[PDB]
């Protein structure tokens, strides 16, 4: 199924879509314009949207740091199930609560 992965969407369309179709805690994954091959998590927090870059080497998936995963689903479900491990410099956690779908 992998319904949270939107294959044909820009970051600004995703950013708008989360503020219409989702709630705080909603999120999705997209293919990333800035670096083809990579992916990007787009999450909603406190009425606004944050974007997180995901490195795909070919060998593994990661967030330019942290735990490394064999597949993208393993990475997304990991950070869903371990909420505190996704933190920003500020100190705030970024929570992947509710997947948004096609």
């Amino acid at each position: 199924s992998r319904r949270w992965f939107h294959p044909n969407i820009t970051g600004v369309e995703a950013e708008n879509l989360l503020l219409t179709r989702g709630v705080d805690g909603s999120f999705l994954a997209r293919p990333s314009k800035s670096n083809p091959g990579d992916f990007t998590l787009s999450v909603r927090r406190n009425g606004a949207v944050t974007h997180i870059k995901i490195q795909n080497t070919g060998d593994y998936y990661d967030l330019y740091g942290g735990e490394k995963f064999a597949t993208l689903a393993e990475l997304v479900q990991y950070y869903m199930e371990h909420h505190g491990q996704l933190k920003e410099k500020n100190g705030d956690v970024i929570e992947l609560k509710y997947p948004l779908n096609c």
């Binding site: 820009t10 970051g11 600004v12 950013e15 314009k33 800035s34 990007t40 949207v49 944050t50 974007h51 997180i52 870059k53 967030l63 330019y64 740091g65 942290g66 491990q85 996704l86 933190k87 920003e88 410099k89 970024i94």
Partner: peptide, 10 residues
């Protein structure tokens, strides 16, 4: 576009 948040790790 809009910026990508700066993630930190233990």
């Amino acid at each position: 576009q809009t910026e990508y948040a700066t993630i930190v790790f233990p």
